[PDB]
């Protein structure tokens, strides 16, 4: 019966600004404490800031890596919570929640100013930040080595570095090599560029008799790459 709908999120270049909205219904908003919590991609929840209630003068406290750029405000006449953001950066991208903040203080064993819990949560609104334009991948070989090889088997891949955006398809020897092949998911570099790595395991008695090549393909830039890999020296 308690409903919180976040909106006002989307794509923006770094240095830009944004204003998030969060409706409220099913509870007395005019006095509730409210909190903004964000979840970066793949990472956990991170407390942003919280605006208190009338007994506290509508005072606000902000997270350290955030204080100075953001400002929280509230319109109790319409039950709306606002988060203005300035000088946005890539780090700031992520899901943004508004949460009804409750308060706890165990009189006998508590310590001021007590704790705060987050009763209800909205589905949240996704923010995204990029200064990225399409880029082609820069392939790099992941050479084996006598120190690297474990048993008669040897492990070898490619490094698709600094490209943008997804997706990227990889094969080895033009698909003729499927046994022992596994292509990893892509990491999203804080710089705003994707990178991933393919890899295949093979006999070490085959390095001479066989030549190994990874077939990268980046349609988003009309780019294809073939990279030969060879033992170290």
């Amino acid at each position: 019966e308690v409903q919180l709908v976040e909106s006002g999120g989307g794509l923006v270049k770094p240095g830009g600004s944004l204003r998030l909205s969060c409706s409220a219904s099913g509870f007395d908003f005019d006095n509730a404490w409210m909190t903004w919590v964000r979840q970066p991609p793949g990472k956990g929840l991170e407390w942003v800031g919280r605006i208190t209630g009338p007994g506290e003068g509508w005072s606000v406290d902000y997270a350290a890596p955030v204080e100075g750029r953001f400002t929280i405000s509230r319109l109790n006449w319409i039950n709306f919570l606002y988060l203005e953001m300035n000088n946005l950066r890539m780090e700031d991208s992520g899901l943004y929640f508004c949460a009804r903040t409750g308060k706890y203080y165990d009189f006998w064993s508590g310590y001021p100013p007590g704790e705060e819990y987050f009763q209800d949560w909205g589905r949240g609104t996704l923010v995204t930040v990029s200064s990225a334009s399409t880029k082609g991948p820069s392939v790099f070989p992941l050479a084996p080595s006598s120190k690297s090889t474990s048993g008669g088997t040897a492990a070898l891949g490619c490094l698709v570095k600094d490209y943008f955006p997804e997706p990227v398809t990889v094969s080895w020897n033009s698909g003729a090599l499927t046994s022992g092949v596994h292509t990893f998911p892509a990491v999203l570099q804080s710089s705003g560029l994707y990178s991933l790595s393919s890899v295949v395991t093979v006999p070490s008695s085959s390095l001479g008799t066989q030549t190994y090549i990874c077939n990268v393909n980046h349609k988003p830039s009309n780019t294809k790459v073939d990279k030969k890999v060879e033992p170290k020296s």
């Binding site: 009189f107 508590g110 001021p112 007590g114």
Partner: peptide
């Protein structure tokens, strides 16, 4: 009036959660 202003400051403390938590902890001991 000068003295009455002071009692107004106390009036808020007891309705300021943050000031409260320091009132209660003051009583605990």
């Amino acid at each position: 009036n000068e003295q009455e202003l002071l009692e107004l400051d106390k009036w808020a403390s007891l309705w300021n959660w943050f000031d409260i938590t320091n009132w209660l902890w003051y009583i605990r001991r």
